Design brief:
The structure is a homodimer. By secondary structure, chain A is an all-alpha fold. Chain A has 14 helices and two strands; from the N terminus they run ααααββαααααααααα. In chain A, about 70% of the residues lie in helices and about 0% in strands. The radius of gyration of chain A is 22 Å and the shape is globular. The structure holds 2-methoxy-N-[(1R)-1-phenylethyl]acetamide (4 copies) and zinc ion (ZN) (4 copies). Chains A, B: Its cofactor is Mg(2+).
Chain lengths: ~350, ~350
């Protein structure tokens, strides 16, 4: 069976499980089950499934080099698919809550879930809560007798918690740290002193890299009982590195990819986000460029946003991006080598992960 | 050491642990740690700690009848306090998210967390996420080598998930089930056909009774290694029964307790909630009373809300409440007896829990 078809089939199976349980254990009625069914489909389906499929790809790579009964290959691939949907549903929780937090309009060419007419914020906050709760129900049911259950639960919770802390770093990135204060309404920075490469790197490490790259790779090792084929410090290192590059790409597209192709109107500038573009611009600007940036960044006025886009265009940030890219190519290729000492297989999976990111066009 | 002082001391210990970890593992800076510290204090402290202290009370009752080394008594009471704060922090997650969902203003005489000037909804949704994440970090750290760790994690997740499903039942209780539909903006019921005792009971069972009464009692059994001193079906039965009574009290106070003493302006009527008062009123009203209720319920207009309060007052709902109360006194006293077959101790703890609820004046 082809991996994607397996993956999709298990979605159906998990969905039926979750909704049937609601009916047998939680007294749900047909109409609320249907609401939840729709919510699950709308919030979990329609992406590329890169995260979830990476768990399956990692587990297929070990199946090719490890001796097992056919029924054990099937059980490993079924566990890889369940674990991959745990990650997809965890992403769906974060996207639904993030979209409400940020006042987002669209995602992927469709309205954000909270904007659906019959959802509203009052239901959507709780729908997002439920999405994450469903990851736990999956694990306790499908993995109940598995040796990896503790490790997988403990990894998932650390990853979830990192991601929430990253969300906190992201949404406070345009404030001065020393002025954070629940009692006092928060002004936008005026100095941009915290728009640095290391502070950027912190935000991105936590907000995206743990759930997007670290979790899929490590979940694939866990469902395969293969965590001894790797040096975990290397897998963390490469995950964080590739995931940073991924976010840098996102940041560039937020500004420059036209909305119809982006699936969104990008507002990082108006939102005063600490984006790769802002940090890299500041890192090369002269005094007058810095002043013009300060006078225009973090405002809804479209003329001011255009002045920012103009400044970035004139600043030849494509060049700094090519330099960044070269350096990441270099470091990721080194880490893949350190990963071969223990597993060619695991290294190849990391190689694919890299190729898909590096060569992604959307 | 007195139980409450122990309990409070462990708060300090857990808080320090959580913030120190943020600094050693998650790259936090001092100012964001301080933000989180304040958020934890504001959202977790200032109640009666009834839920968390019930875990400690249940564990103290078993200590009086079970032989242990002093160091084991201390470890049990420390685990009971950690487990009690897991429950308090889980409540704090639900209160912060519920207040945003419902557009609440105050809680306990202070602004809701999201309304603080330097919080805002964008941070508060994620702060609530973090609150629940902290319950997991507590458990994996304090209970890492404990025999009850799996059982406690599995119970906590089922309770969390029930509570979210209860939130869904609560916020959709004024819509017709057969019209739920993410695509279509939801009208208020006009028939009130779903304002029934059984539908009420479902809402309350899930929204409040699992986290408020079932979880504290069962966590106390788990940290004591005492789940064989009970028949779990009875503990579930009594938890749900007492927790229903608790909510009925809340519902009555929402309408009739003056705001300064309530800590809140009550809006259940304007919000068209399926409250005990509405269900009980409908269950005794004549045709003209039902019509007047329909014409006035679920509106912000204060004249219409006063017409509802008037209808409830004239309807002698104190009498139906006394009848309800008598019946609950009767059934809870029976369950306490079935609970004595296996544990006098556990029965007494349930007795205290009941007394505190029955005789609570706030
Ligand atoms: C829609 O964008 C076209 C496009 O090639 N996007 C990819 C993802 C990309 C690569 C490198 C830097 C920025 C963006
Ligand atoms: C690929 O995105 C659309 C786009 O026009 N990007 C431009 C060429 C760019 C700017 C800054 C950094 C990298 C690339
Ligand atoms: C502030 O309310 C006074 C008061 O006694 N409240 C308690 C909680 C109560 C008991 C029974 C029914 C309703 C309310
Ligand atoms: C105790 O709350 C304040 C209050 O005036 N309550 C009244 C007496 C009441 C109405 C309906 C049901 C029970 C009690
Ligand atoms: Zn965001
Ligand atoms: Zn972006
Ligand atoms: Zn609510
Ligand atoms: Zn209430």
């Amino acid at each position: 069976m082809a991996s994607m078809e397996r993956f999709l089939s298990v979605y159906d199976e998990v969905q039926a499980f979750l909704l049937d349980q609601l009916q047998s254990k939680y007294e749900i009625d047909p109409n609320r089950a249907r609401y939840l069914r729709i919510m699950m489909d709308t919030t979990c389906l329609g992406g590329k499934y890169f995260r979830g499929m990476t768990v399956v790809n990692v587990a297929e790579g070990f199946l090719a080099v490890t001796q097992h009964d056919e029924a054990t290959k099937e059980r490993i691939l079924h566990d890889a698919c369940v674990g991959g949907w745990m990650i997809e549903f965890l992403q769906a929780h974060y996207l639904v809550e993030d979209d409400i937090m940020d006042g987002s309009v669209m995602r992927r060419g469709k309205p954000c879930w909270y904007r659906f007419p019959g959802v509203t914020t009052q239901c959507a906050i709780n729908d997002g809560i439920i999405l994450k709760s469903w990851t736990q129900i999956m694990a306790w049911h499908y993995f109940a007798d598995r040796p990896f259950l503790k490790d997988l639960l403990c990894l998932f919770q650390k990853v979830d918690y990192a991601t929430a802390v990253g969300q906190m770093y992201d949404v406070t990135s345009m404030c001065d740290s020393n002025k954070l204060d629940p009692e006092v309404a928060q002004p936008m920075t005026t100095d941009f002193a915290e728009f640095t490469p290391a502070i950027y790197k912190r935000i991105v490490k936590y907000k995206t890299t743990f759930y997007t790259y670290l979790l899929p790779l490590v979940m694939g090792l866990l469902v395969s009982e293969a965590a001894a084929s790797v040096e975990m410090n290397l897998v963390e290192r490469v995950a964080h590195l590739i995931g940073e590059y991924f976010q840098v790409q996102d940041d560039v597209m937020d500004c420059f990819t036209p909305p119809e192709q982006l699936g969104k109107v990008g507002t990082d500038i108006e939102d005063a986000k600490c984006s790769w573009l802002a940090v890299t611009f500041l890192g090369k600007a002269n005094a007058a460029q810095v002043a013009e940036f300060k006078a225009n960044y973090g405002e809804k006025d479209p003329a001011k946003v255009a002045v920012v886009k103009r400044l970035y265009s004139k600043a030849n940030l494509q060049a700094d991006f090519a330099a960044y890219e070269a350096e990441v190519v270099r470091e990721v290729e080194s880490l893949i080598e350190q990963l071969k000492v223990k597993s060619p297989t695991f290294a190849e999976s990391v190689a694919v992960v890299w190729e898909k990111t590096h060569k992604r066009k959307k």
